[PDB]
């Protein structure tokens, strides 16, 4: 899954 | 008894895998991974750690009976269905992680396992000794030496938070995850009550895709945010939020108390409207 800063 | 149990669990997981013909957590991925780990356990048990209640054998008796009940639930199910299957995927994700934490490679390490937070580590080994698992009722009373919870709805909400595998028993791994999520230790239950009982932004047992979906309801309200435990980095939080342009993003923050992270994000104008609601609670 895409977790961003 | 134990080798029979392991054989039964592996067969149930093979049945499910065959009956299950997406993004994490995914049963299709987790079923064969768990069955492979169980096989590794079985080989290792036929050649152990400190004996008695709460040891390796006790852990497996409990774990395998729960894994059967959960596997029966999945079988019985193959919008409501989508939710029931996402909740069970999270539960299997947690069962798989707990067994990987305590029997990596099939080889028991619950008597050596070390918690992430030092004060919580000390509490577990001083209170529980070499044990890797306790029934809820005994855990509640042991935790109560340090951090007592009010019996009733509050204690039951705590149970639901801590018990990742929904097994009724607390392993040292679950306690590791709980004390990371709700650090710092000296105020553990006050942190938990403020964040997981009283805060509108807290969601329990949701996947990444379920928060993506839920926050679409607030996409015209930049600043809206929810937080829930990560399913792939257990012990860490995942914060979903609506950015200035209406896009739904999710971030895993720095290893620090969630309260500090939420306070900073409020002050910076990013986490303003918990679950899109008008009132942000004060966390000071
Ligand atoms: Ca459990």
PDB file of C-alpha atoms and ligand atoms in Angstrom, chain B residues 98 162-171 174, ligand 1:
ATOM      1  CA  UNK B  98       2.105 -13.209  15.831  1.00  0.00           C
ATOM      2  CA  UNK B 162      -5.167  -5.267  22.610  1.00  0.00           C
ATOM      3  CA  UNK B 163      -6.460  -8.583  21.276  1.00  0.00           C
ATOM      4  CA  UNK B 164      -5.252  -8.408  17.644  1.00  0.00           C
ATOM      5  CA  UNK B 165      -6.034 -12.075  16.952  1.00  0.00           C
ATOM      6  CA  UNK B 166      -9.475 -11.869  18.710  1.00  0.00           C
ATOM      7  CA  UNK B 167      -8.352 -14.994  20.582  1.00  0.00           C
ATOM      8  CA  UNK B 168      -9.270 -13.919  24.141  1.00  0.00           C
ATOM      9  CA  UNK B 169      -5.626 -14.208  25.166  1.00  0.00           C
ATOM     10  CA  UNK B 170      -2.871 -11.579  25.083  1.00  0.00           C
ATOM     11  CA  UNK B 171       0.526 -12.645  23.675  1.00  0.00           C
ATOM     12  CA  UNK B 174       0.149  -8.154  21.083  1.00  0.00           C
TER      13      UNK B 174
HETATM   14 CA1  LIG C   1      -4.928 -12.556  21.061  1.00  0.00          CA
END
